Scaffold this active site. Structure first.
Site, PDB file in Angstrom:
ATOM      1  N   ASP A 131      -4.177  -1.414  11.733  1.00 41.96           N
ATOM      2  CA  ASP A 131      -3.480  -1.308  10.454  1.00 41.96           C
ATOM      3  C   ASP A 131      -2.867   0.062  10.277  1.00 41.96           C
ATOM      4  OD1 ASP A 131      -2.568  -1.521   7.873  1.00 41.96           O
ATOM      5  OD2 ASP A 131      -4.548  -1.502   6.924  1.00 41.96           O
TER       6      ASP A 131
ATOM      7  N   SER B  10      15.015   3.747   5.951  1.00 38.79           N
ATOM      8  CA  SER B  10      16.008   2.912   6.599  1.00 38.79           C
ATOM      9  C   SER B  10      17.392   3.226   6.062  1.00 38.79           C
ATOM     10  CB  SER B  10      15.674   1.432   6.359  1.00 38.79           C
ATOM     11  OG  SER B  10      16.704   0.592   6.861  1.00 38.79           O
TER      12      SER B  10
END
Length: 330
Positions: free
Chosen positions: A35, A199
């Site tokens: 994770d 992004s």
């Protein structure tokens, strides 16, 4: 040193991925959910409330000659999906894919929430975010990666998740045969303890690319792709019959639909998520309404590039003094 381990989807929907981890001496092999959005290595154990164990493999520290109780240490964690667990702490030897750390904090669960009990395939989590998020008290502990880092050939790990197929976590090296083209690296902020990056934009299907900054986290422990409501609306508007359902808890679509791809930007580069990766199947057995793999982050408080996004790429988690993330097509 290096390590290399195969990671395997837990079910036919790629709801999560498990990777075998050797703990203790003799080894006890547990299948853990790696994770990158958390920083605790915790396991089902001989100490876990018996009624809260349903099919998981447990760690029994009393059977490990290298286990040592970390005196006075406790842990307690709550995840973004509402699940939780807590317990005490041992140090022990932990190996992943041939890479061994001695003195790793192994957090033994005394209590786990229902979602963990109900998932027989996940024996615990191995956190790979920054150690500043580790919940051990009163002395915070380091992640497996943090402990291994100095010994690794290169201070990196890579995630290569498969679509409906196994993939690979590598530690200490970049497998140049595992991706196409080049890896594009992008800046990371560690201020929230995550692999947080920005992004450069998105496209839906064969549509034009929209240049826009989307700050979010690379999170192998989250199944879906959570993005701003504007972006998500633009995606689902291209699927006839798709709608956001409050009763179901997100966007659903007719299972008869063909889903468009979704592209996200990494610098000047582009990662394409095929439409099929966005299908999470019937909302309930036999239903013709299917659950979407791109959902709104509104009310999460953060955008999450979960498995839906990451499995479309070869992803480098670069733990150099100034961390960065790298993405390549594959």
């Amino acid at each position: 040193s290096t390590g290399s381990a195969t990671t395997t989807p837990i079910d036919s929907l790629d709801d999560a991925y498990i990777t075998p981890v050797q703990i203790g001496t003799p080894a006890q092999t547990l299948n853990l959910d790696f994770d990158t959005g958390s920083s605790d290595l915790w396991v089902f154990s001989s100490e876990t409330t018996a009624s809260e164990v349903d099919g998981q493999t447990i760690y029994t520290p009393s059977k490990s000659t290298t286990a040592k109780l970390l005196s006075g240490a406790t842990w307690s964690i709550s995840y973004g999906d509402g699940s939780s667990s807590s317990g005490d702490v041992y140090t022990d030897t932990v190996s992943v894919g041939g890479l061994t750390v001695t003195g790793q904090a192994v957090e033994s669960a005394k209590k786990v929430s229902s979602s963990f009990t109900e998932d027989s395939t996940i024996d615990g989590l191995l956190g790979l975010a920054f150690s500043t998020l580790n919940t051990v008290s009163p002395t915070q502990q380091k992640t497996f990666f943090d402990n291994a880092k100095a010994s690794l050939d290169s201070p990196v790990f890579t995630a290569d998740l498969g679509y409906h197929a196994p993939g690979t976590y590598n530690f200490g090296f970049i497998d140049t045969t595992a991706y196409t083209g080049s890896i594009t690296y992008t800046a990371v902020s560690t201020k929230q303890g995550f692999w947080e990056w920005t992004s450069t934009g998105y496209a839906v299907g064969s549509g034009t690319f929209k240049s826009t900054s989307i700050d979010g986290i690379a999170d192998t422990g989250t199944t879906l792709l959570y993005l701003p409501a504007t972006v998500v609306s633009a995606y689902w508007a291209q699927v006839s019959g798709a709608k956001s359902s409050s009763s179901v808890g997100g966007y659903v679509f007719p299972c008869s639909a063909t889903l468009p791809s979704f592209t996200f930007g990494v610098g000047s580069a582009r990662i394409v998520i095929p439409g099929d990766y966005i299908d999470f199947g019937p909302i309930s057995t036999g239903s013709s309404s299917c659950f979407g793999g791109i959902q709104s982050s509104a009310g999460i408080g953060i955008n999450i590039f979960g498995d839906v996004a990451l499995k479309a790429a070869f992803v480098v988690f670069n733990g150099a003094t100034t961390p960065t993330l790298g993405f390549a097509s594959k």
